[PDB]
Amino acid sequence: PIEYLLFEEPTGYAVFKVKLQQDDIGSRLKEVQEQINDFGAFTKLIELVSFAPFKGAAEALENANDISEGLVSESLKAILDLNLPKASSKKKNITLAISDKNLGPSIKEEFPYVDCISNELAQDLIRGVRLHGEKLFKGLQSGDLERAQLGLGHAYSRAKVKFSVQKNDNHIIQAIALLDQLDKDINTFAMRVKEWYGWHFPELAKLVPDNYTFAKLVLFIKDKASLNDDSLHDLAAGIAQRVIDNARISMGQDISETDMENVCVFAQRVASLADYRRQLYDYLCEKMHTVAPNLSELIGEVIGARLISHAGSLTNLSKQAASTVQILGAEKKNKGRISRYLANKCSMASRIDNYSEEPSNVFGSVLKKQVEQRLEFY
Amino acid sequence: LTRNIPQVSSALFFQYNQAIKPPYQVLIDTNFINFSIQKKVDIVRGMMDCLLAKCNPLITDCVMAELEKLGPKYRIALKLARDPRIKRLSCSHKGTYANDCLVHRVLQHKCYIVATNDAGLKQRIRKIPGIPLMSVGGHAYVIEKLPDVF
């Protein structure tokens, strides 16, 4: 009496009619419990008769949570109301081979005419359908099981932990590891703008040494033909007169054109990169103020991002001890005991703003006042 | 190429075997039950009188198969060895041979003491190091290499 089976799967619910029966008395024998392993005899024993996939991802998570606490839900109750026949009271009531005794009473409460069962026969029949997996379903689906169960597992784990997805330190990690490399890339490509515009105007590297305003005035003057407009160079940059008369006295000059046009394209794009740096630094300034405010107020924003980058993650920094927050360069006798004090106060602030749910600034401020009193001790 | 030399099991000394704490686990076997009966000593009270400590006896499925296999002369032995005071192991190997079942069982654990009486099993047990055998003798038991008999 096992004639219907219910299997739950991370794409949908399945219900199997049990065609013939398993040998109950000899159900520990080798020649019976190898039939569950091989496939040519399991489909003699179990056929698919219904498979309704929940299609919403959040509805899959909700079905998984209701099964994991052992409670019926809409899709499960729907397919059992569809598939399970009303066994009339003259014959019997229908039986259903479900996987767990925690689920059992909650379907017996809702359907009276069903009767759940999980002995070792239902256990190893569900084990057999779990082992054979996709090859039972004979193509009534769109999507394999393992990627769907990967997503459903990660979602079920985060819904159990109720993990705060606003405590985001990986953003600050990638922000500072992009910021320093992007400063290096702006400097290298601006050296290429200098070395490429030297052939057209080599007395500009002496006058205008700043990379960004060099690139912007290279975007301004195309060829050496300006000679008059003095009232735009203090805007784009006194030295206006030096670059204007050096635009006719110098003449270390190649007169080339298409390369000057691509120099112009390169220079305006390097200026765009400088604008991107000048906004991303401010972005991680305020994101350092949001994520890690006590350590931000104590040590500074970019020094804090460098320190969390050296640690690897904020949680790893916090579970580091307070003497292994030795990092070279950052936290710049009487020159060393102040750095040790600042080190373990930085570890204290790291503990506060990581293990809080969402942190404040008052402890960063009183930490700043404590370390400033320790500095004025000198 | 995987060689396999078993390490000397790290709850053993040179030959002191500090893993045998006084609540003992003994391994009863077949002719030891038979000689216990035909010397008319008891089992649990006899072991307590020989060792001055609480002993938990064990019989394996191989030894129970031997005791069933030896026919109806030792129905007294089988009724005695189905005692609810003893426990029971569960072997998994081919061939119900009490000798190599016992000596394998004890040389991969070094914590059981072996309550035997036949010559070949006593020879193999006292050949391998640092497990104590006991045996019937006179009207009591006798221990061979326990470090604190008294």
Binding site: S318, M348, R351, N354, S356 | -
Partner: protein, 121 residues
């Protein structure tokens, strides 16, 4: 559901901190949060105690993630000044640890305390 969940009541508090004072007189105790986490990620720690009223609670709440990962019991105690008086030191210590040592004469009381607090958690 607060952030200092295994908070010990009164009688268990008194027995764990007289075990603390016996350990401090037997030279088997580490006093303070960062030496506690140093001996914790070194591994020698029978169990660790925190104080549930330090003015930032997170400066010792960083110890759960180490200790229940490295499988060692941990207990909150409702008074840092009582734990300081227990450790036998002037300033209030907020996070103590008991090192592991099988050559110390309080092994029985340490194991009784550890069994009681594993049943508590």
């Amino acid at each position: 559901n607060p952030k200092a969940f295994p908070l010990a009541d009164a009688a268990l508090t008194q027995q764990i901190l007289d075990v603390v004072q016996q350990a401090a007189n037997l030279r088997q105790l580490k006093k303070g949060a960062n030496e506690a986490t140093k001996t914790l990620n070194r591994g020698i720690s029978e169990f660790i105690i925190m104080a549930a009223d330090c003015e930032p609670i997170e400066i010792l709440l960083h110890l759960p993630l180490l200790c229940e990962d490295k499988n060692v019991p941990y207990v909150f105690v409702p008074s840092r000044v009582a734990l300081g008086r227990a450790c036998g030191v002037s300033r209030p210590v907020i996070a103590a640890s008991i090192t592991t040592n099988d050559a110390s004469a309080i092994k029985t009381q340490i194991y009784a305390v550890k069994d009681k607090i594993e049943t508590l958690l």
